[PDB]
Scaffold this motif. Structure first.
Motif, PDB file in Angstrom:
ATOM      1  N   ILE A  37     -10.474   8.903   2.525  1.00 55.56           N
ATOM      2  CA  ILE A  37     -11.563   8.201   3.197  1.00 55.56           C
ATOM      3  C   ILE A  37     -12.285   9.133   4.161  1.00 55.56           C
ATOM      4  O   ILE A  37     -13.518   9.118   4.250  1.00 55.56           O
ATOM      5  CB  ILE A  37     -11.038   6.943   3.914  1.00 55.56           C
ATOM      6  N   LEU A  38     -11.538   9.956   4.899  1.00 55.32           N
ATOM      7  CA  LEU A  38     -12.172  10.916   5.796  1.00 55.32           C
ATOM      8  C   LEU A  38     -13.005  11.925   5.016  1.00 55.32           C
ATOM      9  O   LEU A  38     -14.091  12.318   5.452  1.00 55.32           O
ATOM     10  CB  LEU A  38     -11.114  11.633   6.636  1.00 55.32           C
ATOM     11  N   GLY A  57      -4.313   5.227  -2.472  1.00 55.39           N
ATOM     12  CA  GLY A  57      -3.822   6.505  -1.984  1.00 55.39           C
ATOM     13  C   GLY A  57      -3.107   7.302  -3.057  1.00 55.39           C
ATOM     14  O   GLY A  57      -3.191   8.531  -3.091  1.00 55.39           O
ATOM     15  N   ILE A  92      -0.324   6.050   2.398  1.00 56.08           N
ATOM     16  CA  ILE A  92      -1.324   5.761   3.427  1.00 56.08           C
ATOM     17  C   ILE A  92      -1.968   7.037   3.950  1.00 56.08           C
ATOM     18  O   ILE A  92      -3.205   7.074   4.071  1.00 56.08           O
ATOM     19  CB  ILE A  92      -0.699   4.915   4.555  1.00 56.08           C
ATOM     20  N   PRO A  93      -1.224   8.095   4.288  1.00 56.91           N
ATOM     21  CA  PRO A  93      -1.889   9.315   4.771  1.00 56.91           C
ATOM     22  C   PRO A  93      -2.885   9.883   3.779  1.00 56.91           C
ATOM     23  O   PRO A  93      -3.956  10.351   4.180  1.00 56.91           O
ATOM     24  CB  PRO A  93      -0.718  10.279   5.018  1.00 56.91           C
ATOM     25  N   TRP A  94      -2.568   9.844   2.483  1.00 54.72           N
ATOM     26  CA  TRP A  94      -3.485  10.396   1.492  1.00 54.72           C
ATOM     27  C   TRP A  94      -4.728   9.530   1.347  1.00 54.72           C
ATOM     28  O   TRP A  94      -5.834  10.050   1.169  1.00 54.72           O
ATOM     29  CB  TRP A  94      -2.773  10.556   0.153  1.00 54.72           C
ATOM     30  N   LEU A  95      -4.572   8.207   1.425  1.00 47.92           N
ATOM     31  CA  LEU A  95      -5.741   7.336   1.409  1.00 47.92           C
ATOM     32  C   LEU A  95      -6.627   7.600   2.618  1.00 47.92           C
ATOM     33  O   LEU A  95      -7.856   7.653   2.497  1.00 47.92           O
ATOM     34  CB  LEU A  95      -5.309   5.870   1.370  1.00 47.92           C
ATOM     35  N   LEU A  96      -6.022   7.770   3.796  1.00 52.08           N
ATOM     36  CA  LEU A  96      -6.808   8.075   4.986  1.00 52.08           C
ATOM     37  C   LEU A  96      -7.524   9.412   4.842  1.00 52.08           C
ATOM     38  O   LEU A  96      -8.690   9.545   5.230  1.00 52.08           O
ATOM     39  CB  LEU A  96      -5.910   8.081   6.224  1.00 52.08           C
ATOM     40  N   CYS A 110       0.834  -1.193   0.000  1.00 54.49           N
ATOM     41  CA  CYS A 110       0.000   0.000   0.000  1.00 54.49           C
ATOM     42  C   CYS A 110       0.873   1.249   0.000  1.00 54.49           C
ATOM     43  O   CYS A 110       1.861   1.338   0.734  1.00 54.49           O
ATOM     44  CB  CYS A 110      -0.927   0.002   1.215  1.00 54.49           C
TER      45      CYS A 110
END
Length: 362
Positions: A19-20, A204, A12-16, A9
């Motif tokens: 999602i937010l 992400g 990760i921060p951009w995927l989170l 993956c």
């Protein structure tokens, strides 16, 4: 170095964050419903088809014969310093031939625009429903008065995200086709495998690419609206957005090979593009021109039957989709061709993965 190696993956921060943000959009559509917007909006408060099919049949034929059309078509335009650029036009033609071959090996790829359009239409219907709901949520007081600002930003970001997801899926399919040594052990469902790889990993990366695109798109829309609500227009940044969009597509392909984060993949893609700046100009100016002539071929033949104006419109819309994927496959094939050249040579143990036609070009 090996392609398609130990994927993980990325971003990760951009995927989170994405999602937010999607959860925030769901919160918009949930607050509107809970306050009563849904109930008080839905309930309120006080011959021809045959030619259209021929557009699909002829367009699909063009995905398999445009490689041969361009080989002899460029000559008549060449009838009358051009010699320096000739090798790059030859490279463009070879890439078109390889695109035709991958279409032959992956017939289902032509329908990717239809699935992407279905997803985009579903999201657009949901967004229009939520916009209508917001048109009656509440007057609405407090900081939530900018819920529609949030909603428009979300429209732009999510639309760009779906388009970039289409780009990543096509890039993954083409990468799997290209880096597979022999084509007789191809995956049973290359496109489904590409979609699975995009969903499980690299979501992400697509989210960050769409965020970057929308960060520039929003200023363009605001500038357009302000200029319409009036001197000199600096909206030429649309060229920057168009150039940035091309960089993002080349960043997804670099992410699909090395499983790298978006920043590293974008840096590598930019380095490759500048290292082959002249080749990129020829593929994106001569290749694109031949694609446009292909579109004119489809609409002209479909309308050659004759009332039927709607038939010509439908043929143009489908032609812009099939040809659009042909430009996506050609561009992805070029970057994969450049990654192979940089990371591999003719020596044993680092054998080229490219086709015979492109072999002679380097």
């Amino acid at each position: 170095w090996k392609p398609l190696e130990d994927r993980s993956c990325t971003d990760i921060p951009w995927l989170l964050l994405f999602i937010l943000f999607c959860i925030g959009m769901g919160f918009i559509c949930g607050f509107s419903i809970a306050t009563g917007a849904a109930a008080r909006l839905v309930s309120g408060y006080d011959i021809i088809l045959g030619l259209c099919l021929l557009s699909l049949v002829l367009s699909m034929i063009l995905m398999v014969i445009i490689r041969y059309i361009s080989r002899v078509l460029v000559w008549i335009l060449t009838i009358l310093i051009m010699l320096v650029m000739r090798k790059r036009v030859a490279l463009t033609i070879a890439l078109f031939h390889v695109a035709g071959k991958v279409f032959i090996h992956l017939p289902l790829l032509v329908f990717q625009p239809f699935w992407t359009f279905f997803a985009l239409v579903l999201f657009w219907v949901y967004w229009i429903m939520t916009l209508l709901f917001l048109g009656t949520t509440g007057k609405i007081s407090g900081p939530l008065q900018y819920m529609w600002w949030y909603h428009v930003v979300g429209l732009i970001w999510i639309s760009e995200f779906i388009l970039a997801c289409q780009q990543m899926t096509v890039a993954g399919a083409v990468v799997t086709y290209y880096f597979t040594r022999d084509k007789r052990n191809l995956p049973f469902t290359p496109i489904l495998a590409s979609v699975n790889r995009l969903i499980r990993y690299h979501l992400g990366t697509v989210a960050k690419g769409s965020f970057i695109i929308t960060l520039v798109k929003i200023p363009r829309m605001i500038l357009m609206y302000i200029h319409s609500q009036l001197k000199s227009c600096i909206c030429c940044l649309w060229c920057l957005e168009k150039c940035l969009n091309y960089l993002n597509q080349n960043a997804y392909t670099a992410t699909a090979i090395n499983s790298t984060n978006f920043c590293t993949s974008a840096k590598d893609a930019f380095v490759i593009l500048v290292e082959n700046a002249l080749r990129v100009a020829t593929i994106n100016t001569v290749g694109d021109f031949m694609l446009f002539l292909g579109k004119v071929l489809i609409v002209c033949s479909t309308g050659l039957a004759g009332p039927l104006i709607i038939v010509c419109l439908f043929a143009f819309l489908v032609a812009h989709c099939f040809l659009s994927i042909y430009e996506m496959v050609v561009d992805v094939l070029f970057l994969c061709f450049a990654i192979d050249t940089k990371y591999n040579d003719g020596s044993p143990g680092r054998e080229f993965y490219m086709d015979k036609v492109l072999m002679e070009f380097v």
